[PDB]
Structure formats: C-alpha cells, structure tokens
Design a protein around this ligand. Structure first.
Ligand SMILES: [Zn+2]
Length: 143
C-alpha cells in the first residue's frame, strides 16, 4: 500500500491521488492498457521512504508493499519483492535491484530506504491483469 498523497494516473492520463481511487476505477498500466482497482483499504502506520539517486519523487509505502524491480544479471530480469524482504538484504545484493519507469535511462537506482519515525495514512487496493500501474511520473508500481 502507498502513502496518501501518492499521485497516480487514471486510464485517460489524468492524475488521481491514491486515496481518491474508488472501487472499479480505471488506472493506467505500463503498456498503456487499462487496469481496474478494487478492494480499497486504508490504514495508518510507520511507512518506509525510498529515495533514488535520480531526481524523482520519493516512494513511501508500507513494509509489506511489493516493489516491481529489475535485478542485474538481457542484463536484467524482472523481480517482485516486498519492502520487508528487500530491506533485509545486504546492501551488496541491494545494488542489483532497480526501480523502473515505463519505456516512453528508465532504470532508477535506490539511494536509501528507511523506516519513518512517525505513522502516516496509507491507501491500498488490488489491480487486475499484471497487477502493475503507473505513478504520475511513469514509475511502475505493483499492488
Ligand atoms: Zn497497493
């Protein structure tokens, strides 16, 4: 699940805050096709903040959120990993995993991932098809 205030793309390209996503809403998939959101859930807890080397917005999500990543050795493979599992990996293994944006480099390098000191509100849902959808800046997100 994602911190409230995360900016996503509706299927028509307009922006929607993650907490404004309603049952049945249509979001944008990484291939440009539609995705349907369902099972809206909300909570409040200490989230993990992920900052990249590149100048894009931090990603703030729950400990059980699934990151969709490319892991080194074409040269990379697609891997899904929860924040918990990723946080516990040695940093030398952490190299190899990169976040990614939908191809119109598109790989993003994580500089830090840290548990935040105070709880904040989050919103989550499930998405059909490949469970992937787009942040407003085309960062590829998983359910
Ligand atoms: Zn979610």
């Amino acid at each position: 699940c994602l911190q409230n205030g995360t900016r996503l793309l509706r299927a028509d390209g307009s922006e929607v805050l993650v907490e404004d996503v309603q049952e049945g809403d249509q979001l944008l998939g990484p291939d440009g096709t539609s995705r349907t959101a369902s099972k809206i859930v909300r909570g409040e807890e200490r989230l993990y903040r992920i900052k990249t080397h590149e100048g894009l917005e931090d990603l703030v999500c729950t400990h059980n959120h699934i990151l969709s990543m490319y892991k080194e050795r074409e040269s990379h493979e697609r891997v899904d990993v929860t924040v918990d599992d990723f946080v516990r990996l040695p940093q030398q293994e952490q190299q190899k995993y990169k976040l990614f944006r939908s191809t119109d480099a598109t790989l993003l390098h994580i500089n830090s991932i840290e548990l935040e000191e105070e709880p904040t509100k989050w919103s989550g849902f499930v998405v059909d098809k490949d469970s992937l959808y787009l942040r407003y800046d085309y960062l590829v997100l998983h359910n």
